[PDB]
Scaffold this active site. Structure first.
Site, mmCIF file in Angstrom:
data_model
loop_
_atom_site.group_PDB
_atom_site.id
_atom_site.type_symbol
_atom_site.label_atom_id
_atom_site.label_comp_id
_atom_site.label_asym_id
_atom_site.label_seq_id
_atom_site.Cartn_x
_atom_site.Cartn_y
_atom_site.Cartn_z
ATOM 1 N N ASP A 79 -4.426 -19.570 16.967
ATOM 2 C CA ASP A 79 -3.024 -19.726 16.641
ATOM 3 C C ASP A 79 -2.693 -19.337 15.132
ATOM 4 O OD1 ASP A 79 -0.792 -20.596 15.673
ATOM 5 O OD2 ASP A 79 -0.666 -22.424 16.924
ATOM 6 N N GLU A 102 -6.430 -31.288 10.925
ATOM 7 C CA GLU A 102 -5.062 -31.030 11.842
ATOM 8 C C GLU A 102 -5.405 -32.083 13.068
ATOM 9 O OE1 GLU A 102 -4.550 -27.958 15.192
ATOM 10 O OE2 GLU A 102 -3.844 -30.293 14.927
ATOM 11 N N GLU A 110 -3.067 -37.680 21.680
ATOM 12 C CA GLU A 110 -4.419 -37.892 21.217
ATOM 13 C C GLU A 110 -4.774 -39.222 20.117
ATOM 14 O OE1 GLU A 110 -6.392 -34.118 20.001
ATOM 15 O OE2 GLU A 110 -4.664 -33.016 20.241
ATOM 16 N N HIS A 166 0.705 -22.813 19.665
ATOM 17 C CA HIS A 166 -0.274 -23.198 20.863
ATOM 18 C C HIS A 166 0.360 -24.540 20.954
ATOM 19 C CE1 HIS A 166 -2.284 -25.366 17.706
ATOM 20 N NE2 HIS A 166 -3.059 -26.170 18.649
HETATM 21 C C1 LIG Z 1 -6.008 -32.743 16.914
HETATM 22 N N1 LIG Z 1 -5.157 -31.723 17.782
HETATM 23 C C2 LIG Z 1 -5.616 -30.259 17.813
HETATM 24 C C3 LIG Z 1 -4.511 -29.506 18.121
HETATM 25 O O1 LIG Z 1 -4.746 -28.144 17.845
HETATM 26 C C4 LIG Z 1 -4.304 -29.316 19.825
HETATM 27 O O2 LIG Z 1 -3.120 -28.935 20.067
HETATM 28 C C5 LIG Z 1 -2.767 -28.710 21.366
HETATM 29 C C6 LIG Z 1 -1.479 -28.011 21.433
HETATM 30 C C7 LIG Z 1 -1.120 -28.145 22.961
HETATM 31 C C8 LIG Z 1 -1.679 -28.443 23.912
HETATM 32 CL CL1 LIG Z 1 -1.195 -28.337 25.475
HETATM 33 C C9 LIG Z 1 -3.120 -29.362 23.692
HETATM 34 C C10 LIG Z 1 -3.765 -30.061 24.630
HETATM 35 N N2 LIG Z 1 -4.191 -31.194 24.730
HETATM 36 C C11 LIG Z 1 -4.964 -31.741 25.761
HETATM 37 C C12 LIG Z 1 -5.312 -33.057 25.566
HETATM 38 C C13 LIG Z 1 -5.676 -33.478 24.362
HETATM 39 C C14 LIG Z 1 -6.439 -32.985 23.607
HETATM 40 N N3 LIG Z 1 -5.992 -34.851 24.584
HETATM 41 O O3 LIG Z 1 -5.391 -35.335 25.922
HETATM 42 C C15 LIG Z 1 -4.852 -34.275 26.366
HETATM 43 C C16 LIG Z 1 -3.992 -33.965 27.441
HETATM 44 C C17 LIG Z 1 -5.238 -30.967 26.780
HETATM 45 C C18 LIG Z 1 -6.017 -31.484 27.789
HETATM 46 C C19 LIG Z 1 -4.750 -29.674 26.645
HETATM 47 N N4 LIG Z 1 -5.173 -28.602 27.824
HETATM 48 C C20 LIG Z 1 -5.303 -28.654 29.220
HETATM 49 C C21 LIG Z 1 -5.273 -27.300 29.354
HETATM 50 C C22 LIG Z 1 -3.895 -26.931 30.095
HETATM 51 C C23 LIG Z 1 -4.162 -26.907 31.567
HETATM 52 N N5 LIG Z 1 -5.282 -26.234 31.925
HETATM 53 C C24 LIG Z 1 -5.304 -25.157 32.736
HETATM 54 O O4 LIG Z 1 -4.155 -24.649 33.318
HETATM 55 O O5 LIG Z 1 -6.614 -24.496 33.054
HETATM 56 C C25 LIG Z 1 -6.199 -23.731 34.440
HETATM 57 C C26 LIG Z 1 -6.595 -26.567 31.378
HETATM 58 C C27 LIG Z 1 -6.409 -26.602 29.698
HETATM 59 C C28 LIG Z 1 -4.920 -27.161 28.019
HETATM 60 N N6 LIG Z 1 -4.019 -29.043 25.608
HETATM 61 C C29 LIG Z 1 -3.472 -29.477 22.212
HETATM 62 N N1 LIG Z 2 -12.067 -40.033 15.526
HETATM 63 C C1 LIG Z 2 -12.580 -38.812 15.247
HETATM 64 N N2 LIG Z 2 -13.806 -38.700 14.428
HETATM 65 C C2 LIG Z 2 -14.263 -37.434 14.354
HETATM 66 N N3 LIG Z 2 -13.672 -36.403 14.745
HETATM 67 C C3 LIG Z 2 -12.552 -36.450 15.714
HETATM 68 C C4 LIG Z 2 -12.013 -37.630 15.860
HETATM 69 N N4 LIG Z 2 -10.968 -37.329 16.710
HETATM 70 C C5 LIG Z 2 -10.929 -36.087 17.060
HETATM 71 N N5 LIG Z 2 -12.104 -35.366 16.399
HETATM 72 C C6 LIG Z 2 -12.326 -34.033 16.307
HETATM 73 O O1 LIG Z 2 -11.069 -33.344 15.624
HETATM 74 C C7 LIG Z 2 -11.076 -32.137 16.048
HETATM 75 C C8 LIG Z 2 -9.452 -31.763 16.087
HETATM 76 S S1 LIG Z 2 -9.049 -30.007 16.560
HETATM 77 C C9 LIG Z 2 -8.908 -29.416 14.743
HETATM 78 C C10 LIG Z 2 -10.282 -28.756 14.681
HETATM 79 C C11 LIG Z 2 -10.162 -28.081 13.025
HETATM 80 N N6 LIG Z 2 -10.296 -28.979 12.117
HETATM 81 C C12 LIG Z 2 -9.159 -26.950 13.196
HETATM 82 O O2 LIG Z 2 -8.351 -27.139 12.448
HETATM 83 O O3 LIG Z 2 -9.376 -25.786 13.638
HETATM 84 C C13 LIG Z 2 -11.647 -32.035 17.333
HETATM 85 O O4 LIG Z 2 -12.908 -31.266 16.966
HETATM 86 C C14 LIG Z 2 -12.215 -33.384 17.693
HETATM 87 O O5 LIG Z 2 -13.376 -33.350 18.238
#
Ligand SMILES: CNC[C@@H](O)COc1ccc(Cl)c(-c2nc(-c3c(C)noc3C)c(C)c(N3CC4(CCN(C(=O)OC)CC4)C3)n2)c1
Ligand SMILES: Nc1ncnc2c1ncn2[C@@H]1O[C@H](CSCC[C@H](N)C(=O)O)[C@@H](O)[C@H]1O
Ligand SMILES: CNC[C@@H](O)COc1ccc(Cl)c(-c2nc(-c3c(C)noc3C)c(C)c(N3CC4(CCN(C(=O)OC)CC4)C3)n2)c1
Ligand SMILES: Nc1ncnc2c1ncn2[C@@H]1O[C@H](CSCC[C@H](N)C(=O)O)[C@@H](O)[C@H]1O
Lengths: 344, 344
Positions: free
Chosen positions: A32, A124, A133, A281
């Site tokens: 992204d 992030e 999350e 994303h």
């Molecule tokens: C710490 N945050 C890091 C960010 O960069 C994550 O940003 C995103 C943005 C958009 C999305 Cl939709 C997601 C984000 N989250 C979570 C998530 C998490 C993690 N914890 O609970 C949940 C629910 C999940 C599971 C998730 N995905 C499941 C997914 C969509 C449906 N899939 C599929 O169609 O495959 C066939 C499998 C892959 C993508 N995406 C993360």
């Molecule tokens: N309580 C916690 N302690 C340590 N790591 C954690 C956490 N909760 C989430 N994470 C980690 O945090 C990351 C968030 S995703 C972002 C990853 C990276 N900093 C980037 O910007 O590209 C994941 O790899 C996840 O495993």
């Protein structure tokens, strides 16, 4: 026994860290460009916030943000990562000749030990709809390591809420649920389950982007200040709203997006997921009302969006809204952890 | 506790029953007309196997297969279901006025108590590549309730495997992996992770359909007889193969599909997920070799596919293959639980 483990069902945690243990998932976030490019710019353009400083990277994943802190001249970066991605981060620190400056600490930020306090925390931690999350609480927890007067990148987050009209999205829920309205599916009357099927679809927030023309009023904003907030502030998030309708039509729900700001010594840099900005994303998130509301331009749509944290690393969402001029009301419950990933 | 919990990680079981507790998922399976219509035909065309008999439905879901047994004249049907879908099945049994014949029993088939022994057990326990889910073992476990000489519907299952060539698929996966080959991603060298990344991407079986023209040799067949097998037979499944190559080219991996047969007193009915047959929600499954093998028509490709049951309701797959004429070998390890759902 930690702040994290008491807050989180072990089954959710296992699934959560398995998900981040894949290089393909780290790659999804890295790829992204708006996200990764903006983090890089925020750190490099604020080089004086990093030069010869001590840094904590909360949830380092691949280690990418820690490498940017290094590009900006940080003396020491503690990169904390709870998934099995920690071993891959370590491989990269070694291969990039940065063993003297980046120290990968495997484990939960709520559980590990840092050997010193830090000047700045980078992370992030944003989920879809910002709050999914509950990693924002990990990021706040991490301030136990921050020197008084230390900074945080990002510094603040804003969630925006606005009512929308989208008749086609609304009608799609009934279309899908009407599978169950058949009196003789292979001889079986499925009809008794049609209501349950409707409820199931309406409980799922819809993760996808959309055209800005669906929006019916100026957004309301709810701000989390990461420098000031305590973890407990994220347990019950109450967002009142009083929308002054710009357009007449049927309100089918609320749309959500978020921005974060990196407030540095040199400049403030913003990362936006708004539907007026290039797609990220994170997409955007819409919560439907199972009962839509008629409003005319000039009416007020008032109510509250209440998010209550749960032990599945997410929130239960309750949205109540009414049109003040008519009193017609709509009440809605959604499970943020299990949305409809409509973009797929 | 039970046979089930002893072989199943709690984190896996929670996610698994959550998946099946969605009406949308039951609909996905129910709407596969080849699957559901064939089950109905197998049951109705073998009516004398059901008429006035006692039936066990293992994992009844919506209750659909139990309705078919009731249609065929069964006296009593115990419909066992461990997800929250059990509560929806009971709703349908009441609304279909079958309270006197279908008895829903919430819980795992390994943990519930049935009132009596049964004449026949029906189930749909097949995962993708047949063996995903380890539900076959629940189906086999259920034989503790089967009367001597009782029957099983399905009675046997055949897995087929054949070598394939598909440069486009190979390069699609390889290209995703080679993100981790970049020496300067935003100035960061990721290349030391290339091997890990290739291992990760190639560890994913590919779930989707294909043109039969990709197949390079007649399939090898491995049969599980459900009437005869013990749950323990499924802990370690060894499938040797020796293919007589029909075409020259690169073997990019093995393709898998499966058929099941309902062997009733009146007729045998086959349900097939073969790529020569109409598509089903099972598609087909391909395991790629990260190092493809060159073979000439008339060569023999020999080796073993070994599946080892794991605690995540799936199997660790090893495929070792060699072109006998050249001694060219490819060894591969795949995580069946975590595939690439390419058909989406
Ligand atoms: C710490 N945050 C890091 C960010 O960069 C994550 O940003 C995103 C943005 C958009 C999305 Cl939709 C997601 C984000 N989250 C979570 C998530 C998490 C993690 N914890 O609970 C949940 C629910 C999940 C599971 C998730 N995905 C499941 C997914 C969509 C449906 N899939 C599929 O169609 O495959 C066939 C499998 C892959 C993508 N995406 C993360
Ligand atoms: N309580 C916690 N302690 C340590 N790591 C954690 C956490 N909760 C989430 N994470 C980690 O945090 C990351 C968030 S995703 C972002 C990853 C990276 N900093 C980037 O910007 O590209 C994941 O790899 C996840 O495993
Ligand atoms: C007892 N077996 C019952 C059978 O009917 C199940 O048959 C299938 C056939 C094909 C697929 Cl691919 C699946 C099958 N399985 C498992 C599974 C299970 C279950 N346990 O571990 C795993 C992994 C999972 C998770 C699974 N899906 C995730 C999925 C990805 C694609 N999707 C999408 O793009 O929109 C939602 C929907 C959600 C489809 N599909 C099931
Ligand atoms: N050990 C076990 N005990 C009880 N139910 C189980 C089980 N393992 C899987 N199941 C249930 O078995 C079902 C398999 S899907 C098939 C559903 C239905 N018989 C139909 O053919 O349409 C799922 O609902 C799953 O929750």
């Amino acid at each position: 026994r930690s702040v994290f483990s008491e807050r989180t069902e072990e089954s959710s945690a296992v699934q959560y860290f398995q998900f981040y243990g894949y290089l393909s998932q780290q790659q999804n976030m890295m790829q992204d460009y708006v996200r990764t490019g903006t983090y890089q710019r925020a750190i490099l353009q604020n080089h004086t916030d990093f030069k010869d400083k001590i840094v904590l990277d909360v949830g380092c994943g691949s280690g990418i943000l820690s490498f940017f802190a290094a590009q900006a001249g940080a003396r020491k970066i503690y990169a904390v990562e709870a998934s099995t991605m920690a071993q891959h981060a370590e491989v990269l620190v070694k291969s990039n000749n940065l063993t003297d400056r980046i120290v990968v600490i495997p484990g939960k930020v709520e559980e590990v030990s840092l050997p010193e306090q830090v000047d700045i925390i980078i992370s992030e931690p944003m989920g879809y709809m910002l709050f999914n999350e509950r990693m924002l609480e990990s990021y706040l927890h991490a301030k136990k390591y921050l020197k008084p007067s230390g900074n945080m990148f990002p510094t603040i987050g804003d969630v925006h809420l606005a009512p929308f009209t989208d008749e086609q999205l609304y009608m799609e829920q009934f279309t899908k649920a009407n599978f169950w309205y058949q009196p003789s599916f292979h001889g079986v009357d499925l009809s008794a389950l049609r209501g349950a099927a409707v409820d199931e679809y309406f409980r799922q927030p819809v993760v996808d982007t959309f055209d800005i023309r669906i929006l019916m009023a100026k957004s309301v904003k709810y701000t989390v200040n990461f420098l000031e907030a305590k973890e407990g502030d994220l347990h019950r998030i109450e967002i009142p709203f009083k929308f002054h309708m710009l357009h007449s039509g049927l309100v089918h729900g609320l749309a959500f997006w978020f921005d974060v700001a990196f407030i540095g010594s040199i400049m403030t840099v913003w990362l936006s997921t708004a539907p007026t900005e290039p797609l990220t994303h994170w997409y955007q998130v819409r919560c439907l009302f199972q009962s839509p509301l008629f409003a005319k331009a000039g009416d007020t749509l008032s109510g509250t969006c209440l998010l209550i944290a749960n032990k599945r690393q997410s929130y239960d969402i309750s949205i109540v809204a009414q049109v003040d001029q008519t009193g017609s009301k709509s009440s809605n419950l959604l499970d943020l952890k299990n949305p409809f990933f409509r973009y797929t």
